[PDB]
From Swiss-Prot:
Phosphoprotein recorded as keyword: yes
Subunit structure: eIF4F is a multi-subunit complex, the composition of which varies with external and internal environmental conditions. It is composed of at least EIF4A, EIF4E and EIF4G1/EIF4G3. EIF4E is also known to interact with other partners. Interacts with EIF4ENIF1/4E-T; promotes recruitment to P-bodies and import into the nucleus.
Domain of life: Eukaryota
PANTHER family: EUKARYOTIC TRANSLATION INITIATION FACTOR 4E, EUKARYOTIC TRANSLATION INITIATION FACTOR 4E RELATED
Physiological role: Acts in the cytoplasm to initiate and regulate protein synthesis and is required in the nucleus for export of a subset of mRNAs from the nucleus to the cytoplasm which promotes processes such as RNA capping, processing and splicing. Component of the protein complex eIF4F, which is involved in the recognition of the mRNA cap, ATP-dependent unwinding of 5'-terminal secondary structure and recruitment of mRNA to the ribosome.
Result for mutant: R126E: Abolishes binding to the 4ESE element in mRNAs
Keywords: Acetylation, Cytoplasm, Initiation factor, mRNA transport, Nucleus, Phosphoprotein, Protein biosynthesis, RNA-binding, Translation regulation, Transport
Impact noted for substituting W42A: Binding to CYFIP1 reduced by 70%. Does not affect mRNA nuclear export or nuclear pore complex reprogramming. Does not affect affinity for mRNA cap. Reduces interaction with LRPPRC. Reduces affinity for PML and viral Z protein
Single annotated GO MF: mRNA cap binding
GN (gene name): Eif4e
Protein name per the record: Eukaryotic translation initiation factor 4E
GO CC aspect terms: chromatoid body; cytoplasm; cytoplasmic stress granule; cytosol; eukaryotic translation initiation factor 4F complex; glutamatergic synapse; nuclear body; nuclear speck
């Protein structure tokens, strides 16, 4: 009642990446903490830096517990990502609101029967332009990928004029598979 936390459908892990050239890419990836209730999500979100305030070269990742935010995870190797590319002006205007909306689409299971295809999301803070992406587990599942892309674009509020693409991790690791 007035004392039980509200369990989320999934337990989530927040990851941090800091670009450091002394280390391999994988060694720069670090798990911050995990949560599985509404209350613990907000406690964590409220304690950490907004993405717009991180140094260029850093990432946040939020993934279902047990899935690492890397292509080589069994749940990512056959998958891909719906990519949101932000210009440098949208660092100020949309980065933080887009990322929080992305976080909520994940923990709120916003993609109906296809929320099981979601692995996680990643925001890259970069000088050349930031990126936000939702990662899904199977790039050949056209129906799941397309529905997630349509729900995502509308939850972000992007105008029907704007087009976003989905790329497979196989292609990234070595073009768009889908567009909405
Ligand atoms: C090794 O090279 C990979 C990739 O080319 C590099 C940069 O990925 P990045 O996502 O930073 O692309 P950007 O264009 S946003 O980066 P930048 O050019 O602006 O600094 O980081 C590595 N990388 C990245 N990811 C997501 C993986 C992974 O999942 N697995 C392995 N093994 N490597 C990975």
């Amino acid at each position: 009642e007035h004392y039980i936390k509200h369990p989320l459908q999934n337990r989530w892990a927040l990851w941090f990446f800091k670009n450091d050239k002394s280390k391999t890419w994988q060694a720069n990836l670090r798990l911050i903490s995990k949560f599985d209730t509404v209350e613990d999500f907000w406690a964590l979100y409220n304690h950490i830096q907004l993405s717009s305030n991180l140094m260029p070269g850093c990432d946040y990742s939020l993934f279902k517990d047990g899935i690492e935010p890397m292509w080589e995870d069994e749940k990512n190797k056959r998958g891909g990502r719906w990519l949101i590319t932000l210009n440098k002006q949208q660092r100020r205007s949309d980065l933080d609101r887009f990322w929080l909306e992305t976080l909520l689409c994940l923990i709120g299971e916003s993609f109906d029967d296809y929320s099981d295809d979601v692995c996680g999301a990643v925001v890259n803070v970069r000088a050349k332009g930031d990126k936000i992406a939702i990662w899904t587990t199977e790039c050949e599942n056209r129906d799941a990928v397309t529905h997630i892309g349509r729900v995502y674009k509308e939850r972000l509020g992007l105008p029907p004029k704007i087009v976003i693409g989905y790329q497979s991790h196989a292609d990234t690791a070595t073009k768009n598979r889908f567009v909405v």
